[PDB]
Each structure stands twice: as structure tokens, then as C-alpha cells.
Design a protein around this ligand. Sequence first.
Ligand SMILES: O=c1ccn([C@@H]2O[C@H](COP(=O)(O)OP(=O)(O)O[C@H]3O[C@H](CO)[C@@H](O)[C@H](O)[C@H]3O)[C@@H](O)[C@H]2O)c(=O)[nH]1
Ligand SMILES: [Mg+2]
Length: 520
Amino acid sequence: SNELSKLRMRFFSALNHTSEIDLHTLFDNLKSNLTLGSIEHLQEGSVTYAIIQELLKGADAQKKIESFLKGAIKNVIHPGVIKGLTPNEINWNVAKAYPEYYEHEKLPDVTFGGFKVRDSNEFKFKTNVQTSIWFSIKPELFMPSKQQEALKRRREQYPGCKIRLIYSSSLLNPEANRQMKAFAKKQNISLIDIDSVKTDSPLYPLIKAELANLGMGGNPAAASDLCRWIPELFNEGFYVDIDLPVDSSKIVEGHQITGGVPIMLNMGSIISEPIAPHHRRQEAVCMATDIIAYANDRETQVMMDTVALHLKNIYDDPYTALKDTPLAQTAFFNRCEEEGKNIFELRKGLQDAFRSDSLLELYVFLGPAKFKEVFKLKETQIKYIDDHISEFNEHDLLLHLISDNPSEINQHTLDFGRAKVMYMDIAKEHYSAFYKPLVEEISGPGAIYNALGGASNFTTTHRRSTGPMLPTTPPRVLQVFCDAHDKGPFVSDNIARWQTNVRELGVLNREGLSWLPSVG
Ligand SMILES: O=c1ccn([C@@H]2O[C@H](COP(=O)(O)OP(=O)(O)O[C@H]3O[C@H](CO)[C@@H](O)[C@H](O)[C@H]3O)[C@@H](O)[C@H]2O)c(=O)[nH]1
Ligand SMILES: [Mg+2]
């Protein structure tokens, strides 16, 4: 039959059409327990292939290779394929099963979310259950067309995948609520209203506050970020950003993957410029939360609680989490910290300063140090301004900017109205850098990275090859066992690929984010 023909052709391709042994005899002797799925793990680049190549150089190669492959397929590869193991995971399991044929180091001790990463493949994850989140900032609009179309494109392409959607009914007017419910019914989507969830999570009040405070420093992406760490909302399948495409070629037929931790995230890594004292590059793992996988396991709730306790701590005192951000160098931040202002008041105050259309208000907000930096002033220039600021009106301050640095605005200094706009525009260049950490380091991937162990814990001296990748260093352990993006069928552009050089990240940084409030 064509099935046997297809299998045989795949096998001969995998083993490089070698004539050093008789592949017909070998194929015939293995075919009783050989599937297309297993043959992938015999290909060049695999541990199994590497072992075969060394056996070819020794005596009795025909028999030794048959004995090796029969056992490797029966005991390691085929069981791995059925369980949803990746090629990396199968390579490791083969190396472990055949220490006489493959020299390797032991699994290093790596801690991720308070848990030692395992190579047991014991945590199981469903790829056919997907949850996304949409909180509308416009009461008349349940969801924009882009997001509706994204969900349809996932539903029409795939059943029988279960699609769950968290939203807020309180954010929608009655018509929009009816439309949301109608949409979800038509698309066979399980709807979850965040307004009435039963949970004891400390994150739940914070989510409700983020949404209640829209227009007053709340943020719907921050609300969405926090939902992902409540066990009543997420306990199996994947979280995926609502608009992530599915890569059909990556769908696993058993709809199951595994990992070495009970919660996996989107990961990559960045190889640094050389650092002191040996002029060597460092590999630093990077992570994102646009794809999260949750194991069907009690340990999932345990790990999630560690992260939730960290996020609660950040919300309760955000100034530590923000200590190294641009905003931390402003007078406004220092005042807020002394006053114990909350995250909403911090975000709203920043937005207010940049909506003020006032250089004087911007000065009071930034303080002299950051005002100096933003407007590229000399120390003597900012000293004079700061000494006399209690006497200035708006025009007085503009006159000093014009005298001190007309080049910044290409000597368009004769029209004061235009000059003011140009200086305000220079300041607005920095708004995104001030604002984004107020989500990223608070509820976002910055906070989560820290919750799970922080940079130091995920950064190591860069080391390369040789041969098939094995989990024998910390970044390789995370790459093999902890990365939801590689294993899942969802497409992301949020972060660098694994082992990307810092000078060529190839990540688009978008300007008009959905969750950045405008400042004009
Ligand atoms: O009006 C909005 C806007 C955003 N969101 C939520 O926020 C998520 C991210 O919004 P997106 O426009 O994709 O922003 P990005 O900056 O591209 O998102 C990144 O940064 C966010 C904040 O940390 C994270 O929530 C995302 O997972 C991450 O991909 C969405 O999927 C929604 O869940 C809403 O619910 N309502
Ligand atoms: Mg996005």
C-alpha cells in the first residue's frame, strides 16, 4: 500500500540513503513498530542519528544499529511521540537511555517560579482549550471588528477547540452586552463575566479597581494581565492574546504537550555584547505573557499563588518595582512615593502632565534633573531656571529654552506659538517611556519575570554546541521544558527568538498601543 511506501521513503530520507548498511533489511526489521511520527526523531540533527553515525564506523554495524533502534523506538521515541514530547525532549530521553552511546552532563538544578524544573515530562497541557480577554473602554462597543474577526478565524479553522472569553458586563451598555452574548453564542464561545467571579485571590479587587478607574489611571491591559494569575479563571489550556494567529502546521494531533514546570510562558533569549572581565557574551532568557500554558495539575495552583502574592505586593507598593524606570527620576514620582499615591494616581498624574499643554506644569512634574535631560540643557542653564522658577510665567520659561537650546527645534524661534509646540513635542517623545513601565513592571511581563525569579536567575555566560541541543545549562533547560510558545500552535512577535544577538533583535516596537492613553 501507499502507507507502507510513504513510511519506507521517509525512513530512507531520515537515514541519509546510506549504503554503509542495508537500509532495506533495517527498515523491514523495524517496520512492525515504526510510524511516520517516530521517523522525525531519526533525522539528521537528532541524538538518534548521531548515535547511528558512530555505530556505522564500527564492526557489526547492521546488527548493532538494528538492536539500538528497536529499543530506542519501542522504549523512548514512540512513547514520547504519543505523549506529545518535542524533538528536544525525545533527544534528551534517548541520551539518558543510552549513556553508552551518548556522552552528556546531568540535568542542571534550575528554579522557576519556586519549583525545580523537571525532565520527567510529567506536566500535561491541553492545546485545544484557549482563553482570551477583552475589556472594552467604549461602552457602545462590545469588541472591535479586528478582535471579532480574530476569534472567528480561530473558531472556523478549529474545532473542536474550546474558546473562553473573559469580559466585563459593567463596562458595556445594555445593547453592547446583548451583542456580546449573541456573538459568543453564535461562535460557541464560553463567556466569563469578570464582574461576578467567585475567588479569594488578592488580585480580584485589583482587577476590579483597574476597570473601575478607566479614565482615572486604570488600564484594561493591566486588568487583563492580572486575570491570568487567578486559579478560578485559568486552570487548564492556554491563555492567548485575543489576536494571536494559529500556525496550523504546529497543531499536535493528540492536542497534548508536556513540560517540566506546571506553568509555561512565551520565551526567547538575548545574547549580550561582551562584558567584563573576560570579554564574554551572556545569554539572558526573556519571557512574555501573550502565551501562557497551564497544566492539569495541583502544582499549577501552587505556582500561580507565588506569582499572585508577588503581584499583590507590587500593587500595594509600586515604587520599588518602578525604581529603575524613567519616571523614577521625576519630581512627581518622588512626591507620589512620599505621599503613598497608588498606581492609578501615578498613571493619571503622568497623563495629566502631558495633556497640560504647559511647559511650567511639565517643569513641576519632571523636576530640574529630568527637565534638563529632556531639553538637553547645560547644568548652569537648569540651575538658573530652577533658582528662578517661582518667578516664571509660561513665556519666561519658553524664553530661556529658546536662548539655551534653539537647535533642538532647528532655530524656529521667531514664532513663539510654534516654538512652544515644538518644545512640547520634544517632551511628548518621552511619554511612552514614562508610561509603559506602569503596566509592564506592575502587572506585565516585567513583574512576572521578577515573580518567577528575575534576571540574575535567568542570565548565564553564553555557551554553544556541540551537536543536538540538550538541557545541560539553565537557558537550555528553560528552552526545552518551560517554553509554551515553541510547543503551542500560536504565533507571537512579542519577544526575540531563542539565542538572538542584542544588536539585531528583529522585534517591532509599535507606537500606537491600544492601552496607552492619548496625550495629543
Ligand atoms: O482596550 C483594550 C485593550 C487591551 N486589552 C487587553 O490587553 C491585551 C493586550 O492588548 P494589546 O493591544 O495586544 O497590547 P500589547 O502591548 O501588544 O500587549 C502586550 O502587553 C500587554 C500589557 O502588559 C499584555 O497584556 C499582552 O499580553 C502583551 O502582548 C488584549 O489582548 C486584551 O486582553 C483590553 O482588554 N481592552
Ligand atoms: Mg499585541
